[PDB]
Amino acid sequence: PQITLWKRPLVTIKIGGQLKEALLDTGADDTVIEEMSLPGRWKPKMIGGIGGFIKVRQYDQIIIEIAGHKAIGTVLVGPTPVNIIGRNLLTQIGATLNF
Amino acid sequence: PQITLWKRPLVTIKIGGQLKEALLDTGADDTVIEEMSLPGRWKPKMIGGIGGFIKVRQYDQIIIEIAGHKAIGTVLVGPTPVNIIGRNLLTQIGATLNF
Ligand SMILES: CC(C)(C)NC(=O)[C@@H]1CN(Cc2cccnc2)CCN1C[C@@H](O)C[C@@H](Cc1ccccc1)C(=O)N[C@H]1c2ccccc2C[C@H]1O
Ligand SMILES: [Cl-]
Ligand SMILES: [Cl-]
């Protein structure tokens, strides 16, 4: 689809068997989801936002369906105020910014 | 252009006669620039992201060029970690996300 930017570009995702709303975020290097369980091993990470850093758990090789499009990649889980689809997964669904 | 997301979507902007690097950020509601001088009066604003909030100075009706495209709109100034072009100006220049 073509998504305009008049409002936040929120879409439905499926991750870990769960449906969530998430933001398509070209400024985000990484994908960051609110607290949930994911399978496999994880390691801690600190990631930096405009207001400082938060501690997250990093899970690799996680499948996500983003507005109907499947992708696999690293997903960070922690106390993010909104669920964020970052560039590591936007690339996989073929998302571009156009003007 | 059509900008892919394999790398950060950094572009050159022009504000106050000077060239700066800035991030095209669909996840940002507003545009916020590192400390610089802008004309006129400012209003207070708090902006929140990952990690919490920062206090910024809001300047309205500022002339700004984004990757060659002319805009006139609200620019926030404050201790942002990187210069960010958000949706208020991305809409002005006609930007969309496409996949
Ligand atoms: C991986 C992670 C998510 C941590 N990345 C970011 O937060 C980066 C940080 N850099 C910076 C960085 C920090 C440390 C190291 N390298 C880089 C600047 C750009 N952000 C990306 C932003 O798009 C993230 C959004 C998230 C958000 C959206 C809505 C509500 C809450 C949080 C963001 O912070 N957006 C906010 C935002 C942004 C600008 C202006 C106004 C507003 C309000 C709000 O829309
Ligand atoms: Cl990845
Ligand atoms: Cl591509």
Q: Which residues contact A53 (CB under 8 A, 6 or more apart)?
A: A46, A47, B50, B51
Say whether A81 and B28 touch across the interface (CB within 8 A). no
**B91 in helix, strand or coil?**
helix
B25 is catalytic: yes
Q: d(Cα A50, Cα B82) in Å, to the nearest integer?
A: 8
- Residues in chain A with CB shorter than 8 Å from the CB of B84 are 27, 50
- In the sheet with A2-3, reading across from the earlier edge strand, the strands are A2-3, B96-98, A96-98, B2-3
Distance CA A74, CA A77 (A): 10
B31 phi and psi angles, rounded to 5 deg: -105, 125
Specified resolution (Å): 1.3
| C-alpha distances in Å from residue B86, one per residue of A26, A38, A45, A61, A67 | 10, 31, 26, 30, 22
Interface check for A11 against chain B (CB to CB < 8 A): the answer is no
> From CA B72, how far away is CA B74, in angstroms rounded?
7
- Residue range B1-99 forms a domain whose CATH class is mainly beta
Do A92 and B99 meet the contact criterion of CB atoms below 8 Å apart? no
What distance in Å separates the CA atoms of residue B42 and residue B60, rounded to the nearest whole number? 8
